[PDB]
Amino acid sequence: VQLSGEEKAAVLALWDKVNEEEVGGEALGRLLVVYPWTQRFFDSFGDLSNPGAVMGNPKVKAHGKKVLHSFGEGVHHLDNLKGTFAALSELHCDKLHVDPENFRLLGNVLVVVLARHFGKDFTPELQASYQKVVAGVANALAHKYH
Amino acid sequence: VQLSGEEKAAVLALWDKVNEEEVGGEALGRLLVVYPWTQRFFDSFGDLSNPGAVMGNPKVKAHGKKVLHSFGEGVHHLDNLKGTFAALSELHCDKLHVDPENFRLLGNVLVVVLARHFGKDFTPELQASYQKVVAGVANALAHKYH
Amino acid sequence: VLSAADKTNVKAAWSKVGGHAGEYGAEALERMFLGFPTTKTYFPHFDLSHGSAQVKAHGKKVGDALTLAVGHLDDLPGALSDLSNLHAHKLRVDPVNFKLLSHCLLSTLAVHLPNDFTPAVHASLDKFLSSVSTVLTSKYR
Amino acid sequence: VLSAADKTNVKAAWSKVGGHAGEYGAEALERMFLGFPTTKTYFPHFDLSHGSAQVKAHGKKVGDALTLAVGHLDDLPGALSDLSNLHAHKLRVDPVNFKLLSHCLLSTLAVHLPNDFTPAVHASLDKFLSSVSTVLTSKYR
Ligand code: HEM
Ligand code: HEM
Ligand code: HEM
Ligand code: HEM
């Protein structure tokens, strides 16, 4: 969350190439395929049986965009990370009751999708940066669970 | 972190019956035997070969007792947890490099030792409050760890 | 529980839990709904009140499935088969919940069996509650 | 792995890598020491400097052990036996680290095999690895 002077500048340049509906749906899409117990929280999206049907799912993409768009906010607010999400921390711990460890998971499925979309530009140094940004995002988004 | 009157009062009342010496050692000893990978950070204690010998180990009782005393600090400071331990976080993430999740393990071993020690008094009511202090302590230690 | 000492510490253990399997299964579930609020969710049709007739009776089936596992440490996969379907494929229970339940199950034994719940027995009982939770989520494998 | 569909999908996907087994092995290790700092601690005697000599040489044995596991998916335990001893009993590696390297290994294939790294193949390889890890950490049983 508290990167460096060079890292922030590194994280906000690659995010200018991040395509929020494309990265969101795949990321969301891969989360539900690789970690099926999560489907439980999306029973309203209809059919989530097999891999192809999940990714083509309109409700999986549109929501994918919400998640990534929100991510964008956090990324452009690396200082007030926690507070930028209290609005959402509550939604998941109170209304939804999602387990914190699931935030850690989705951020990881998210780094692999960036890795698949940027290839060798998503260097090991850069991925390191996103892991720092991915965890604090996953945690202050659970700041209302303890 | 954010209990309530009837809870804080119940937590403290019991602590008063907690033997930091006797509970710390058992706690710390039951960590090294159940989660044997934890021995890697204690090679300076000598023989941690088998169960019988770990429990009778002086540096396992001595240190256990420091651990629990530190828990006492948190139990009397449910407001300044991130502070009360700020300089203990750095110690584990920097000089020691312990994984944050080992904190949640220890805390659970600790809860089970209380269970064993207070029996029926350690009611599913009180343990609930307990799982929150542990919640918070294990948390106030990985403050800086992302 | 994939060793000789455990199987021995497991079977040796449950031997002491004997006919309380049910009680504990129940109390363990209470300790879990109270201590880990987010687990309430898999049970809306249950009356999570203390002494509830539902929890008591479900605590029993849990107590049972465990007495069955203790008697089949050689083949947990085949014994706990159908139970794997139910949690993974059907109910789609989050794997984390299993750790939380094994935790609450060990706290319970702690309460009723202090002299029997040794550190040596405490450990094998952990690999066991773990060999179990893994056979019941393996539909994610 | 653990199922037809799943051992199929993991052997076509691993053959698409063929010669790059250790190469990726190394990058995965780099990706891991950089992004997950606390893992360096197991390698003082290694030169973790980018493109080190030790790391790439070790990246190779890792690659190798992974290749000698798809070819024995039926018996992970046998194949990777002496590898359990070394990690669990000798080095006593925390089981969390195995997740981090599996993550870092998945990011590596993805970088290098975008069109072959579909979601289903992504899922299978999460089985392969998770089941791999649960054999090197098994002496904790
Ligand atoms: C990676 C971190 C995550 C972020 C940044 C995120 C973000 C969001 C956002 C922006 C919303 C929209 C809420 C609104 O309409 O105001 C939301 C809703 C929701 N989230 Fe996530 N989320 C995350 C993780 C998770 C996980 C892991 C789960 C799975 C259990 C989850 C389950 C849900 C559900 C079920 C909804 C409601 C969607 C609907 O019913 O329309 N979230 N999340
Ligand atoms: C809530 C949980 C924990 C608390 C409250 C805690 C507290 C402490 C305290 C008070 C010290 C001594 C610091 C000083 O000298 O001022 C310490 C040291 C240490 N801790 Fe922990 N600790 C916890 C968890 C862990 C865990 C799970 C591990 C296992 C990896 C660990 C490994 C160590 C090591 C290696 C030392 C140095 C001991 C020595 O060499 O003398 N700690 N901890
Ligand atoms: C210790 C491992 C577990 C075992 C051996 C186990 C055992 C059982 C058994 C025997 C049944 C069927 C009972 C019947 O015939 O109605 C069952 C059902 C069920 N289990 Fe568990 N369970 C375990 C863990 C969990 C966890 C972790 C959760 C919650 C997070 C859970 C939630 C459920 C639910 C919702 C049902 C269906 C009950 C109903 O709706 O009637 N179980 N379990
Ligand atoms: C993908 C899972 C893993 C596999 C297949 C694996 C495989 C190997 C192999 C083949 C060796 C022996 C190499 C030799 O003969 O020198 C080895 C040694 C070793 N492994 Fe891994 N490993 C894995 C995960 C880990 C993890 C999670 C860590 C810790 C973060 C780790 C740390 C080590 C260390 C320190 C050695 C000793 C190397 C030396 O000092 O020469 N490994 N591993």
UniProtKB/Swiss-Prot annotation, chains A, B:
Q: State the source organism's domain of life.
A: Eukaryota
N-acetylvaline: residues carrying this PTM: 1
Keywords for the protein's UniProt record, in alphabetical order: Acetylation, Heme, Iron, Metal-binding, Oxygen transport, Phosphoprotein, S-nitrosylation, Transport
SUPFAM superfamilies for this protein: Globin-like (SSF46458)
* In-chain residues carrying the UniProt-annotated modification Phosphoserine: 44
Tissue distribution is:
Red blood cells.
Residue numbers binding heme b: 63, 92
N6-acetyllysine PTM sites in chain numbering: 59, 82, 144
A GO-annotated cellular component: hemoglobin complex
The reply on keyword Phosphoprotein is yes
Q: Which GO terms describe its biological process?
A: cellular oxidant detoxification; hydrogen peroxide catabolic process
Report domain Globin positions. Answer: 2-146
**What Pfam families does this protein map onto?**
Globin
Mark the residues carrying the PTM S-nitrosocysteine.
Answer: 93
Q: Which GO terms describe its molecular function?
A: heme binding; hemoglobin alpha binding; metal ion binding; oxygen binding; oxygen carrier activity
Q: Self-association or partners: how does it assemble?
A: Heterotetramer of two alpha chains and two beta chains.
In which family does this protein belong, per the annotation? Belongs to the globin family.
The record's function comment reads: Involved in oxygen transport from the lung to the various peripheral tissues.
Its name, as the record gives it, is Hemoglobin subunit beta
Q: What is the lineage of its organism?
A: Eukaryota, Metazoa, Chordata, Craniata, Vertebrata
From Swiss-Prot, chains C, D:
PTM-bearing positions, type N6-succinyllysine: 7, 11, 16, 40
What are its GO cellular component terms? haptoglobin-hemoglobin complex; hemoglobin complex
Q: Which residues form the Globin domain?
A: 1-141
Biological process annotations from GO: cellular oxidant detoxification; hydrogen peroxide catabolic process
Q: Which InterPro entries match?
A: Globin, Globin-like_sf, Globin/Proto, Hemoglobin_a-typ, Hemoglobin_oxygen_transport, Hemoglobin_pi
Where are the Phosphotyrosine modifications?
24
According to the record, mutating residue 24 to F results in: Exist in both chains
Q: In which tissues is it expressed?
A: Red blood cells.
The record, for Pfam families, names:
Globin
- Highest rank taxon of the organism: Eukaryota
- Carrying Phosphothreonine, the residues are 8, 108, 134, 137
Tell me what happens on changing residue 60 to Q.
In fast chain
Q: Which residues form a coiled coil?
A: none
Q: Which residues bind heme b?
A: 87
List of residues that carry Phosphoserine: 3, 49, 102, 124, 131, 138
What is the protein's known function? Answer: Involved in oxygen transport from the lung to the various peripheral tissues.
- Describe the subunit structure: Heterotetramer of two alpha chains and two beta chains.
The UniProt similarity line reads: Belongs to the globin family.
PANTHER family listed in its UniProt record: HEMOGLOBIN FAMILY MEMBER, HEMOGLOBIN SUBUNIT ALPHA
Please identify the protein, giving its name as recorded.
Hemoglobin subunit alpha
Please give the organism.
Equus caballus
